[PDB]
């Protein structure tokens, strides 16, 4: 399969092309995972820095396909990490915000972007502390399902969330001391 087939955008970016060659290479190597990988196709790519200095590959994908991506995002994501090391691979859906887009819809889409990011792990909660001076500290409490992997990724999640939603957050994982 050609890499451009995997790319929904008519004009594929060079980074987007590279991830497409990676994905079709996984299709060819895979004996049967191709049957799941082949139908999957992503809309685009955005490579975003982090305070840690690494980068994150945000792959924009359709939601009905995003379900199938979530079915296979573990194997696919570790493989993409191997092919592109020092870049955090994350799949996020592209979902409409235009009716200027409405503010309530924007809060909603931001929070879905948050759950899609924290995948494979799940959000335990959301906390907000209001400082005596007036500062607000926003924290998201995550489960310990894949504590090690996300612990290697919390800052990347933070940078992508600030970049996309324009909000400052801190991801914490209860049940251990970080």
């Amino acid at each position: 399969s050609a890499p451009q087939a995997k790319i929904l955008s008519q004009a594929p970016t060079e980074l987007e092309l590279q991830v497409a060659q990676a994905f079709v290479e996984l299709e060819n190597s895979s004996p049967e995972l191709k049957a799941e990988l082949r139908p999957l196709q992503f809309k685009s790519i955005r490579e975003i820095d982090v305070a840690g200095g690494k980068k994150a590959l945000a792959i924009f994908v359709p939601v009905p396909s995003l379900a199938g991506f979530h079915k296979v995002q573990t194997k696919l994501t570790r493989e993409l990490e191997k092919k592109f090391q020092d870049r955090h691979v994350i799949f996020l859906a592209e979902r409409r915000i235009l009716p200027r887009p409405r503010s309530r819809t924007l809060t909603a889409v931001h929070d879905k972007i948050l759950e899609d990011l924290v995948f494979p792990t799940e959000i335990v909660g959301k906390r907000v502390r209001y400082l005596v001076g007036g500062n607000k500290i926003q924290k998201v409490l995550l489960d310990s399902k894949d504590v090690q992997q996300i612990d290697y990724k919390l800052e990347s999640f933070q940078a992508v969330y600030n970049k996309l939603t324009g909000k400052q957050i801190v991801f914490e994982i209860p049940s251990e001391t970080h």
């Binding site: 840690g52 800052e155 990347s156």
Partner: protein, 46 residues
Amino acid sequence: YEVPLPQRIQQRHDRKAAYEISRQEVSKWNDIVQQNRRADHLIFPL
């Protein structure tokens, strides 16, 4: 070389190394402290 670990993970190791150093250097005060505890009488200032 090896790929850089995330700063908090890197810095966690940096903190742990710092805490070990902080322990040894405060431990230098142990010898006088045991002397004060064993001293029959302390006349201030020491």
